[PDB]
């Protein structure tokens, strides 16, 4: 294992408990993260909103910089730390009632990147984008964790994690088997989340001289599905992501390729986005959202 990952995970779960923002005159000081955890237990939701400003304030923002620069690498550590914190205080909401997935969303990033500002050096990092929603697809299931039926000693392995791509369980329900050639998936022991792809488009005011509009594909995973109608300006916060592309086969420039036998595979990709959450920009509900 990695020592640095353990360090960042333990610090994460440490300040999920030790952090406490003041309430100024009215309310003294309260544990904002613990207050949000109590809110989570009360409403039985599935996603926790964490302000980036507080993380920047804490510990001279070194941990904030570390989590912003390498969000993808530390994400499983973040999930584990949050699970342990939930176990410490109010562990009732841990399970679905098999297991309930906890989503972590960061909001109020210091800066906003336009679609034309996407850069390769920001790949895998945390940032925010602002675009206009053009096409929205159906909310479809995706394999959070995948179960399969064995080939030799036909039997079903239960609740195995499914990565970004198809995975094969190395272990077997029968330990003597150690055969994985033919797996038959079963939906019962396979977890799922909500998947929806939204094609955002650059806003008019951000377009340079002469350039025709540029657009990006944004994937909304979790409760944020169907949160934006087509033709609305929304602010997306998430992690910069890459997805394989097979169309750029004749483009100029040497195509990266992997050799392994032969083991050939063209490493061509296109940039996309995975957004943690989306923010847009009777008389009772209307009357409520006023000062």
């Amino acid at each position: 294992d990695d020592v640095t990952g353990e360090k960042v995970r333990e610090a994460f779960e440490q300040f999920l408990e030790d952090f406490s923002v003041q309430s100024t005159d009215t309310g003294e000081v309260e544990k904002v993260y613990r207050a949000q955890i109590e809110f989570m237990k009360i409403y039985d939701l599935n996603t926790i909103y964490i302000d980036y400003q507080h993380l920047s304030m804490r510990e001279n923002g070194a941990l904030a910089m570390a989590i912003s620069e390498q969000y993808y690498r530390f994400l499983p550590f973040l999930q584990k730390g949050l699970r342990r914190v939930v176990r410490k205080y109010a562990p009732e909401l841990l399970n679905t009632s098999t297991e309930r997935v906890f989503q972590i969303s960061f909001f109020n990033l210091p800066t906003v990147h336009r679609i034309r500002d996407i850069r390769s050096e920001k790949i895998g990092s945390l940032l925010s984008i602002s675009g206009t929603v053009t096409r929205t697809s159906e909310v479809r299931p995706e394999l959070y964790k995948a179960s399969f039926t064995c080939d030799m000693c036909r039997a079903i392995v239960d609740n195995v994690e499914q990565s970004f791509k198809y995975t094969e369980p190395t272990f077997c329900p029968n330990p003597s088997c150690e055969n994985r050639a033919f797996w038959t998936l079963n939906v019962t022991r396979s977890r799922f989340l909500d998947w929806q792809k939204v094609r955002i488009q650059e806003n008019a005011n951000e377009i340079p001289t002469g350039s025709m509009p540029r657009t990006l594909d944004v994937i909304l995973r979790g409760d944020s599905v169907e949160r934006a109608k087509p033709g609305d300006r929304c602010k997306f916060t998430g992690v910069e992501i890459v997805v394989p592309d097979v169309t750029q086969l004749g483009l100029p420039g040497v195509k990266p390729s992997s050799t392994l036998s032969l083991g050939v595979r063209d490493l061509t990709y296109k940039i996309s986005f995975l957004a943690c959450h989306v923010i847009s920009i009777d008389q009772e509900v209307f009357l409520n959202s006023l000062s």
Binding site: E178, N179, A181, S261
Partner: protein
Amino acid sequence: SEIHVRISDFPTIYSLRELRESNLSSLVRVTGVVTRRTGVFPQLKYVKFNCLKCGSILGPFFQDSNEEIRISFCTNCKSKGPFRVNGEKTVYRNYQ
């Protein structure tokens, strides 16, 4: 590579005709007169099956003395053809 332990002075002594079947899978101490020797024959101890479909030889698999193991499937590339043995890399043991 390996070491062995040679037990001595077992209590009960049985003649050859008294073995019957209860002594199955059991340590016995019997006496007799040697009649025939079959010479010294090499026997497979650390056999290395080769996978011509993989490209090179596979790992050294311990050969059980009860029966000869077989490579029905290659756990790596699923090869049905090559399960042969290379007498150079294979490590043998004495047998009489």
